[PDB]
Amino acid sequence: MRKKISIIGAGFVGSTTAHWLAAKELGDIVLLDIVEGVPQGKALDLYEASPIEGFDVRVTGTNNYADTANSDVIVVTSGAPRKPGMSREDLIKVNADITRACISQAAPLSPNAVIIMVNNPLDAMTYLAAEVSGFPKERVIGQAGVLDAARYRTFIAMEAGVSVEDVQAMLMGGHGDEMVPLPRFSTISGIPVSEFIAPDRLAQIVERTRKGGGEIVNLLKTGSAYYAPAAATAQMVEAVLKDKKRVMPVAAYLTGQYGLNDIYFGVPVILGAGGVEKILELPLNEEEMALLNASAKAVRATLDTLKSL
Amino acid sequence: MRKKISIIGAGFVGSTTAHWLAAKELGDIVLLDIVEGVPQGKALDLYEASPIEGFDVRVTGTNNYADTANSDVIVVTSGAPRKPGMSREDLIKVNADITRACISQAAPLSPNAVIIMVNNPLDAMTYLAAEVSGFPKERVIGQAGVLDAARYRTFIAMEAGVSVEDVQAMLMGGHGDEMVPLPRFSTISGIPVSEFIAPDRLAQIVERTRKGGGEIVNLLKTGSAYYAPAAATAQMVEAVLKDKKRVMPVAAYLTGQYGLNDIYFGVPVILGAGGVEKILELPLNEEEMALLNASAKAVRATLDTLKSL
Amino acid sequence: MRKKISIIGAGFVGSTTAHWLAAKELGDIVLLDIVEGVPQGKALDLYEASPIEGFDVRVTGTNNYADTANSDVIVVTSGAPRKPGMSREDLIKVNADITRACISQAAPLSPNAVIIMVNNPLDAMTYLAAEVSGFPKERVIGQAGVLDAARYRTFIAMEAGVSVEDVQAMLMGGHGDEMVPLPRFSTISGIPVSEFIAPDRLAQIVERTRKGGGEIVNLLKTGSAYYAPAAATAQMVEAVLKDKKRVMPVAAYLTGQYGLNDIYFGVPVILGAGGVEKILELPLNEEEMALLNASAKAVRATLDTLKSL
Amino acid sequence: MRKKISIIGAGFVGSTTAHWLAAKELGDIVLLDIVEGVPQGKALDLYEASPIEGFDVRVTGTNNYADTANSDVIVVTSGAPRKPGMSREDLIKVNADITRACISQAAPLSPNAVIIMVNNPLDAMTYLAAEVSGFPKERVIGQAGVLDAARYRTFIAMEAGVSVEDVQAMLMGGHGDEMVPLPRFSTISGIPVSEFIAPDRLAQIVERTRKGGGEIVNLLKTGSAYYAPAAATAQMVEAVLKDKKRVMPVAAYLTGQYGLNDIYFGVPVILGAGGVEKILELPLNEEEMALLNASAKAVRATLDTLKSL
Ligand SMILES: [Cl-]
Ligand SMILES: [Cl-]
């Protein structure tokens, strides 16, 4: 009995996540969407690559939540972009409705699953998925930090002229203005990044990381990033499926860590088959902690709007 | 000095091909398109996946053929779908113009490259690319058969209930009506496919292979297949870069094989760093040869229309 | 949780098999041997390679069968060496005692395991393993054919000038004089090997395959082959762990197939999570049957010697 | 054409390194040894695994240096074993003669190669290799630090309860008493190791790392480690062949870095197609410098013994 991964929402992120996972033979994959034909087509297309690439995975597309039953991991990409005229609460509302509909159908069919959210606003939707599923909180998480850390690591590897395999970095919070950069906690083969890159340039790289998603949006003209978001999501799925105990920034439920309670927030975790197996507590200095507290206030504000719906 | 692969046309097939190649660290990748922003965005997005996936490849996007210089392989996906009102010659004409423009700019900058075409009509455009580049014909080829054989192999593995790693198949010709199926030349770990699958069902699978591209089109609603076409293209690129001597059906220039002269046609080849290193001559029976001759007449008809432009 | 594989016998074959399973992150690995220190040493050495090779599995060396409990697959490599200069009968007696000691201790601790034997004489020892374990016959198999076919495929690829990835071959029986070669059931991308290689040369390749183990012994002057034997064994382990439904020659228990009853014999099977999920019955011609019947007589005589102990 | 790697010394380390390079299809491999039959045997065994493992590279065993011509990398593993019970000085004399014979024959045949030494005493033998070859110093390096760091990272990952993929560590000097441990320059996803592991336990881990080679020797009772030593060596080979710009400790020729001149010593470098492309100069504190200075004195004394031969 192979592992089973269901991916909800068969757009660019969801389908690319299926590609990364299939390539590694990580388990059978169900791609689900509301639109008829689209998940069926992408799934069959990917499956037809399998003799070339040498993986034995069933990739199927479906419009029926029944086909997601007994999944080991559920990935949710479904959501709604904002566009003009919408208020903050309007954007939160439409995504909350989408998230509730997905989780309320999927979770009871896979009571042992780890749920990985990849929609927006990420921390709030992960908080909602935890409420709706009623799963142990360790088993409901969100992907945000692995992507931002990946962009940062790319920029560092680029600038320092070194292998991307040798750059590691931790950060916290959400995306853009809510990101909590922590360049002190990044290294190249154990050596502080700040020994390779001077402060002014490092600050530019931190800012580029903040703006990294919008950078891609501006280039693509239509649509958002998907190759790296899907890679980040897939690395998380892998950590769960193989119990790898990866140390990653992940949206997790806090019970006093960093002085925060009753909130999902991007924090360093050990991630394995149990989901969040540890929340790590970094010795942040006053400047770093000021960044965290400001981000947590913003994340709290979004969460309060969700609760008031 | 890492290998260098340029991919012309940064749509679904071109960008997915970059993904398959990057994942295998096969060389630095240039993604080129006429549209500003789009190749830049997809390329940077893929590059930002690299610390997660562990590959050291430069992936860059560009609108400038100068950036393609000194490539080891050039992949061309650019072309034009037909839609209504267009005649046969009209469709051939617009793709010929696109193909000429791509090859005339790219080929002189990479005089040692192998050119791999993945546009339509595939055999005719490959014939044109050979004329325009003036390269040795062994170094100008087209991807068609690896995809159709992959779909067939998937269907066989599905039906027989066996690993896709154990199914192998040769076929000839082009796509759909121009495909020349050869189920006699397919095996599961050395054992004829016909020992696993009875004639009526095997005929259904052959027909499904013929219709395999349109199957995906019908499901997707908008757009065509890309995961498997890109995998096929990337496997060909790999064969060249690593001199693997893969035995594959490929659109190649014929000088008497199967009784055909002065034509590109899908035939079994040994594919390596020299491009086509051998054209294999199968002992086709009368029924198989009748299929080939009918397909070659159709491919000839397209080629004659190209020549008359 | 993670898959678990126990490998009994920490010699070259056992240790090299462990390396393969671990590199691929196929499961936690227990390496057991009677000699204190040796399995612990090899396991720790392999484990210390993990941050370089990027795998997260436990690799335990042990002298205690208790550490093998609840394994998904048991591999047995323990066996008297070299065809040591004793009688054929002496070899069977010493290996029967080893096999009985190994299986009687390991089997009760892993009642749902698939057992894969890799000692000598291969078919007889697999028969004894079935007897001692009491397991369903589908779950006790022997590795022999995958190695012999690998050597054959290597020789074929080299001679035909093609990729090893494109050569398939089925064969039957045991090793050496007991191998039943089947060049009719071998192909290159679905094309008969006989179309590439002339009959005299092919006969040489067949003979080289029979003598292939001894060719390696003679070169080394001390010890036997282990790289290809371990790869063959690991591939079978993988087939079970990932439920891949590989089509392979393996030593299986026969109940009438090919006219053979109450015997282990190398036959084509579908191998998956259930062990042998199907024994395939090839339409062997008169010549091929003569080879098989002679092979079986010899395998029977080995088995009868075992039964008379 | 394909990359070419020659590995001198067909023992456990050389043969296992070959296995790694081939599995990854990194280039054609030549395994050379003085003993007739042994390298031919090991090479053929490895080659016969290729259709199972899916790699297309040539794997040649030889007694003739002519077969190593025009290699991209030369790996030297040939060396007197075990710290054999002779004097320290005896060990240097025997290995100096072996190293001189190896380098004087191989270097002129591959004038553009990078040489990677893996014999003992490591720094001295790499110094001698530079002398005998006459190659630019950047192209003659020794593998030691990558192994010692791998053992350290293994121990750290196990103790902290995290993925080996997320642990980085830099260290300097040679093996054993000459290792310069640097736990300050080690991290888990960019976070200082000191935050995870208490000082007393970390000190134990450091000592285990110093004794790590001997720990393996004592368990095995015959022979030394080879899995992790070969992985470390292969990773360095890969860094050169794929121009990955890895940041690694390697034995490099010093001209003033860390106060050291005219000596080979384990230092952090950027390693790529050009060999050592940069020697990094860490801001070592007073305590760390004392370790380094003592290490250097000892490495100097080994070197002076070599110079007095
Ligand atoms: Cl231990
Ligand atoms: Cl040979």
Q: Distance between CA B29 and CA C117 in Å, rounded?
A: 46
Displacement of CA A168 from its chain's centroid (Å): 18
A159 and A299 both lie in a single domain: yes
Q: Beta strands of A229-287 (E only): which ranges? A: 246-255, 261-272, 275-279
Phi and psi torsions of B295, nearest 5°: -65, -45
Cβ contact, residue pair B48, A163, below 8 Å = no
Angle subtended at Cα A168 by Cα A167 and Cα A174, rounded to the nearest 5 degrees: 130
Domain finish residue from A121, A144, A167: A144
Is A175 an annotated catalytic residue?
A: yes
Cα-to-chain-centroid distance, residue C62 = 23
Mutation site for B-interface testing, chosen from D25, D26, D56 by largest number of B Cβ within 10 Å: D56
Residue C65, domain extent: 1-144
**SS3 (DSSP) at B237:** helix
Q: Known binding site for substrate: residues of B?
A: 82, 88, 120, 151
Q: Is the backbone of residue A201 left (phi > 0), alpha (psi -120 to 50) or beta?
A: alpha
DSSP state of A221: S
Which residues does residue D184 pair with via DSSP β-bridges, in sequence order?
Answer: none
Contact D38, C219 (CB under 8 A): yes
Sign of the torsion angle spanned by Cα atoms D32, D37, D39, D43? positive
Copy the structure tokens of residue A42.
């992408």
Q: Residues B136, B181: one domain?
A: no
**Cβ(C264)–Cβ(C158) below 8 Å:** no
Which residues are paired to D60 by β-bridges?
Answer: D30
The three-state DSSP-derived secondary structure of chain D is CCCEEEEECCCHHHHHHHHHHHHCCCCEEEEECCCCCHHHHHHHHHHHCHHHHCCCCCEEEECCHHHHCCCCEEEECCCCCCCCCCCHHHHHHHHHHHHHHHHHHHHHHCCCCEEEECCCCHHHHHHHHHHHHCCCHHHEEECCHHHHHHHHHHHHHHHHCCCHHHEEECCEECCHHHEECCHHHEEECCEEHHHCCCHHHHHHHHHHHHCHHHHHHHHHCCCCCCHHHHHHHHHHHHHHHCCCCEEEEEEEEEECHHHCEEEEEEEEEEEECCEEEEECCCCCCHHHHHHHHHHHHHHHHHHHHHHCC
Contacts of B55 (CB under 8 A, 6+ apart): A164, B22, B23, B24, B25
Say how far apart CA B22 and CA B37 lie, in whole Å.
20
Q: Is the dihedral of CA A262, A265, A271, A275 positive or negative?
A: positive
**Residue B154 with chain A: CB contacts under 8 Å:** 47-48, 50-51
Q: What whole-number distance in Å separates Cα of residue A59 and Cα of residue A47?
A: 6
CB atoms within 10 A of CB A304: 10
Ramachandran region, residue B253 (left: φ > 0; alpha: ψ -120 to 50; beta: rest): beta
Does residue B136 share a domain with residue B109? yes
User: At B151, which helix (H) or strand (E)?
Assistant: helix B145-160
Pairing mode, strands A172-173 and A179-180: antiparallel
B57 exposed, middle or buried (CB, 10 Å; 0-12, 13-18, 19+)?
buried
C75 φψ region: left (φ > 0), alpha (ψ -120 to 50), beta (else): beta
Rounded to a whole number of angstroms, the distance between the first and last alpha carbons of chain C is: 42
Residue with the two structure tokens 């992120």? A13
**Cα C127 vs. chain centroid, distance in angstroms?**
13
Residue of C nearest to A272 (CA): C1
Beta strands in B63-178 (DSSP E): 73-76, 114-117, 140-142, 167-169, 172-173
- Is the domain of D172 the same as that of D94? no
Nominal resolution in Å?
1.7
Give the amino acid at A117. Answer: M
Would you call B186 helix, strand, or coil by DSSP? strand
Please, what sign has the CA dihedral across residues D137, D142, D146, D152? negative
Cβ–Cβ < 8 Å for A112, A3: no
Distance between CA atoms of A144 and A125, rounded to whole angstroms? 12
Distance CA C287, CA C265 (A): 18
By Cβ distance, the residue of D25, D245, D273 closest to B242 is: D25
Does D297 share its domain with D261?
yes
Terminal Cα-to-Cα distance of chain D (whole angstroms): 42
Query: Which DSSP letter does residue A80 get?
Result: -
Instruction: Identify the burial level of C309 via C-beta atoms within 10 angstroms of its C-beta, where 0-12 means exposed, 13-18 middle and 19 or more buried.
Output: exposed
What distance in Å separates the CA atoms of residue A299 and residue B87, rounded to the nearest whole number?
Answer: 58
Q: How many CB atoms lie within 10 A of CB B69?
A: 15
CA B37 → CA B4, B18, B44, B194, C273, distances in Å? 21, 17, 11, 50, 48
Residues D70 and D4: beta-carbon distance below 8 Å:
yes
Are C61 and C41 in contact by the 8 Å Cβ rule? The answer is yes
Distance in angstroms (rounded) separating the CA atoms of residues A231 and C167: 33
Question: How would you list the strands of the sheet with A28-32, edge to edge?
Answer: A59-62, A28-32, A4-8, A73-76, A114-117, A140-142, A246-255, A261-272, A275-279
Rounded to 5 degrees, what are φ and ψ at B178?
A: -85, -5
Last residue of a domain, one of C144, C178, C213: C144
Identity at B281, one-letter amino acid code? E
Q: Considering D112, D127, D144, which residue would you say is the last residue of a domain?
A: D144
Which DSSP helix (H) or strand (E) runs through A30? strand A28-32
Q: Backbone phi, then psi, for A261, in 5-degree steps?
A: -130, 150
Any idea how long chain D is?
309
Residues B251 and B151 in one domain: yes
- Both tokens of C67, joined, read 């550490």
In contact, B125 and B251? CB cutoff 8 Å? no
* Distance, CA of B191 to CA of B193 (rounded, Å): 6
**Residue B84 contacts by C-beta under 8 Å, 6 or more apart in sequence?**
none
Distance C44 CA to ligand 1 centre (A): 7
| Experimental method reported for this structure | X-ray
Closest residue to D248, CB basis, from A189, A268, A280: A189
Distance between CA C66 and CA C85 in Å, rounded? 35
Q: Which two tokens stand for residue C169?
A: 């071959």
DSSP character for B202? H
Note the residue count of chain B: 309
Compute, in angstroms, the gap from residue D207 CA to the centroid of ligand 1.
14
User: In chain C, which residues have their Cβ closer than 8 Å to the Cβ of D232?
Assistant: 49, 52
C-alpha to C-alpha distance for C186 and C202, rounded to whole angstroms = 11
Q: Does an H or E element contain B104, and which?
A: helix B88-106
The count of residues in chain A is: 309
Helix C227-241 / helix D38-48 crossing angle, nearest 10 deg: 20
- What is the phi/psi pair of residue A185, to 5°? -100, 50
Determine the distance in angstroms separating the CA of D110 from the nearest CA of chain B, rounded to an integer.
18
Annotated catalytic residue: which of D175, D239, D253, D267?
D175
What kind and span of H or E run contains B235?
Answer: helix B227-241
Q: DSSP alpha helices (H): ranges in chain A? A: 12-23, 38-47, 50-53, 88-106, 122-133, 145-160, 199-210, 212-220, 227-241, 286-308
Is residue C65 a contact partner of residue C106, using CB atoms and an 8 Å limit? yes
CB A235 within 8 A of CB A22: no
Give the C-alpha separation, C151 to B67, whole Å: 45
Task: Find the CATH number of the domain harbouring C125.
Answer: 3.40.50.720
Q: Give B177: exposed, middle or buried? Use CB within 10 Å, 0-12, 13-18, 19+.
A: exposed
CA of C22 to the centre of ligand 2 (A): 29
- Tell me, yes or no, whether D279 and D296 share the same domain: yes
What's the 3-state SS for chain C? CCCEEEEECCCHHHHHHHHHHHHCCCCEEEEECCCCCHHHHHHHHHHHCHHHHCCCCCEEEECCHHHHCCCCEEEECCCCCCCCCCCHHHHHHHHHHHHHHHHHHHHHHCCCCEEEECCCCHHHHHHHHHHHHCCCHHHEEECCHHHHHHHHHHHHHHHHCCCHHHEEECCEECCHHHEECCHHHEEECCEEHHHCCCHHHHHHHHHHHHCHHHHHHHHHCCCCCCHHHHHHHHHHHHHHHCCCCEEEEEEEEEECHHHCEEEEEEEEEEEECCEEEEECCCCCCHHHHHHHHHHHHHHHHHHHHHHCC
Give CA–CA dist A185/A193, Å, rounded: 8
**C136 shares a domain with C274:** no
User: Can you point out the beta strands (E) in B94-217?
Assistant: 114-117, 140-142, 167-169, 172-173, 179-180, 186-188, 191-192
- The upper half-sphere exposure of residue B247, i.e. CA atoms within 13 Å in the direction of its Cβ, equals 27
Given C175, C180, C233, C272, which residue is catalytic?
A: C175
Q: Among partner residues D189, D239, D248, which is closest to A248 by beta-carbon distance?
A: D189
- Strands C186-188 vs C191-192: parallel, antiparallel or unpaired: antiparallel
Q: Going by C-beta distance under 8 Å and a sequence separation of 6 or more, which residues neighbour residue C301? A: none
Q: Give chain A's end-to-end CA distance (angstroms, integer).
A: 42
Using DSSP, state whether A2 is helix, strand or coil.
coil
Can you read off the two tokens belonging to residue B96? 């010929």
- Nearest CA-CA partner of C193 in C228, C155, C148: C155
- Spatial separation of the C-alpha atoms in residues B155 and C274, rounded to whole Å: 23
Question: Taking every pair of C-alpha atoms in chain D, what is the biggest distance, in angstroms?
Answer: 55
Distance C82 CA to ligand 2 centre (A): 22
Query: Is the same domain home to A30 and A126?
Result: yes
The CATH number given to whatever domain includes residue D224 is 3.90.110.10
Q: D308: buried, middle or exposed (CB in 10 Å: 19+, 13-18, 0-12)?
A: exposed
When divided into structural domains, chain B yields a total of 2
Please state, in angstroms and rounded to a whole number, the distance separating the CA atoms of residues C159 and B299.
34
Q: Which residue, B301, B297, B267, B261, is CA-closest to B284?
A: B267
Residues in chain C: 309
Q: Are D26 and D96 in contact (CB under 8 A)?
A: no
CA distance C191 to B185: 5
**How is residue C105 written in tokens?**
């201790």
Looking at residue B113, the DSSP 8-state letter turns out to be: P
* Nearest-CB residue to D52 (from C37, C42, C150): C150
Same domain, B128 and B156: no
3-class DSSP state of A205:
helix
User: Using CB atoms, which chains have 3+ pairs under 8 A with C?
Assistant: A, B, D
Mutate to test the interface with B, among D189, D242, D244 (most CBs of B within 10 A): D242
CB contact at 8 A, D275 and D114: yes
Q: What is the least distance, in Å, from the CA of D245 to any CA of chain B?
A: 9
CA distances from A167 to A188, B47, B208, B283, C27 (A): 5, 14, 47, 56, 27
* C-alpha span between B214 and C71 (Å, rounded): 46
Structure tokens at D176: 């054993």
The answer to whether the CB of B194 falls within 8 A of the CB of A12 is no
- H or E element at residue B149: helix B145-160
User: Rounded to whole angstroms, how far apart are CA atoms B199 and D35?
Assistant: 58
Q: Are residues A172 and A300 in the same domain?
A: yes
Find the radius of gyration of the CA atoms of chain B. 19
Q: Which residues from D are below 8 Å from C49, CB to CB?
A: 150, 227-228, 230-232
Helix A12-23 with B12-23: angle, nearest 10 deg: 30
Start-to-end Cα distance in chain B? 42
- Count other C-beta atoms under 10 Å from residue A64's C-beta: 10
- Residue A155 structure tokens: 């920029």
Closest-CA residue of chain C to A58: C244
* Helix, strand, or coil (residue B157): helix
Contact A52/B151, CB-based, under 8 Å? no
Structure tokens, A43: 């799934």
Cβ(B23)–Cβ(B56) under 8 Å? no
Q: Could you tell me if A149 and A298 lie in one domain?
A: yes
Interruptions in chain D after residues (C–N over 2.5 Å): none
Positions of E strands within chain B: 4-8, 28-32, 59-62, 73-76, 114-117, 140-142, 167-169, 172-173, 179-180, 186-188, 191-192, 246-255, 261-272, 275-279
φ, ψ of residue D82 to 5 degrees: the values are 50, 0
Q: What CA–CA distance (Å, rounded) separates B266 from B276?
A: 12
Contact C247 B161 (CB under 8 A): no
CB atoms within 10 A of CB D86: 13
State the helix-helix crossing angle for C88-106 and C286-307, rounded to 10 degrees.
70
H or E segment to which residue A191 belongs: strand A191-192
- Identify whether the C-beta of residue C228 lies closer than 8 Å to the C-beta of residue C151: yes
